[PDB]
From Swiss-Prot:
Compartmental location: Secreted, Cell wall
Protein name: Streptococcal hemagglutinin
Summary of the function given for this chain in its UniProt record: A cell wall protein involved with PadA in host cell interactions required for colonization and pathogensis. Mediates hemagglutination and adherence to ghst glycoproteins. Recognizes fetuin-A (AHSG), a highly glycosylated human plasma protein, also involved in recognition of human platelets, probably via platelet glycoprotein Ib alpha (GP1BA). Acts in concert with PadA to promote binding to glycosylated human fibronectin (FN1) and vitronectin (VTN), and biofilm formation. Plays a major role in fibronectin and vitronectin binding; binding is mediated by glycosylated regions.
Region feature (Non-repeat region 2 (NR2)): 1-203
Family: Belongs to the serine-rich repeat protein (SRRP) family.
Organism: Streptococcus gordonii (strain Challis / ATCC 35105 / BCRC 15272 / CH1 / DL1 / V288)
Disruption-associated phenotype: Loss of bacterial-mediated red blood cell hemagglutination, no bacterial adhesion to glycoconjugates with alpha-2-3 sialic acid termini. No longer aggregates human platelets. Bacteria no longer bind human fetuin. Bacteria bind less well to human platelets. Triple sspA-sspB-hsa deletion no longer causes human platelet aggregation; a single hsa deletion aggregates platelets normally. Significantly reduced binding to human glycocalicin (GP1BA, the shed form of platelet glycoprotein Ib alpha). No change in platelet spreading on S.gordonii.
Annotated domain remarks: Has a short (SR1) and long (SR22) Ser-rich region separated by 2 non-repeats regions (NR1 and NR2). SR2 is comprised of 113 inexact repeats of SASTSASVSASE. SR2 is thought to extend about 0.2 um away from the cell surface. SR1, NR2 and SR2 are essential for Hsa-mediated hemagglutination and for binding to sialoglycoconjugates (fetuin and NeuAc-alpha-2-3Gal-beta-1-4(Glc)-HSA); removal of the N- or C-terminus of SR2 (residues 448-1459 or 1092-2143 respectively) still allows binding and hemagglutination.
Post-translational events: The protein is glycosylated in vivo; constructs without SR1 and SR2 are not glycosylated.
């Protein structure tokens, strides 16, 4: 038997670092090598793209480094560039191959039913998708159809205060009717409708 791998659903986001760990076990208790690779290229290939996907495995080549009770772990990490293309097909299916002391290597099987095992999908999303802006602030304005500059600034400050985890260099803008736009570093956006963040007292 070859080393067995447990990975996951590895979603990553433009403009952001990522880090995941896969777990690897072997019936011998030992794994000597781990490669993460594209499917193409035959048994000797180590080619992996995109080039910003990195990985590392500590504690290779030691007895008992890959047991059920303490699996070997491989870090899969990197920084997603702002210039990545994002769409419904902007994923990359990759394979984790580990070798035991007898040279048995994890088999690459091209089937989505192996995803989360030795096969995994790296999905690149736009930066906005990492964030779920809180809509729990409320700013009272004079007239919801015509916010002043000071009122627009107050709405933006309230949204920022409720959203400390949004990237500090994301830009929060508010329109004359209170609509909020959060523009992330990769230039994707989230919107918040005005009536979730702004009210007036015009209605008796
Ligand atoms: C032998 O054929 C390969 O089998 C694999 C499984 O073994 C994969 O199924 C398969 O397709 C995908 C994939 O999921 O990786 C579909 C993605 O939509 C697509 N990504 C983009 O286009 C990004 O914009 C594409 C590739 O361009 C990347 O992987 C580049 O290396 O590959 C196929 O080519
Ligand atoms: Na084995
Ligand atoms: Na979002």
């Amino acid at each position: 038997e070859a080393p067995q791998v447990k990975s996951g659903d590895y979603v990553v986001y433009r403009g952001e670092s990522f880090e995941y760990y896969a777990e690897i076990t072997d019936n011998s208790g030992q794994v000597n090598r781990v490669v993460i690779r594209n499917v193409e290229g035959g048994a000797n290939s180590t080619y992996l793209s995109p080039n910003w996907v990195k990985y590392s495995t500590e504690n290779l080549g030691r007895p008992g480094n890959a047991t059920v009770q303490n699996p070997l772990r491989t870090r899969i990490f990197g920084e997603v560039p702002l210039n990545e293309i994002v769409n419904e097909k902007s994923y990359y299916t990759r394979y984790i191959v580990a070798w035991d002391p007898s040279g048995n290597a994890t088999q690459m099987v091209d089937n989505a039913n192996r995803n989360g095992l030795e096969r995994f999908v790296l999905t690149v999303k736009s930066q906005n998708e990492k964030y779920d802006p809180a809509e729990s602030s409320v700013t009272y304005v004079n007239n919801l159809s015509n916010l002043s500059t000071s009122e627009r600034e107050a709405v933006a400050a309230a949204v920022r205060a409720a959203n400390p985890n949004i990237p500090p260099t994301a830009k929060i803008t508010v329109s004359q009717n209170g609509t909020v736009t959060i523009t992330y570093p990769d230039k994707s956006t989230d919107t918040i409708p005005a009536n979730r963040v702004v009210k007036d007292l015009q209605i008796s």
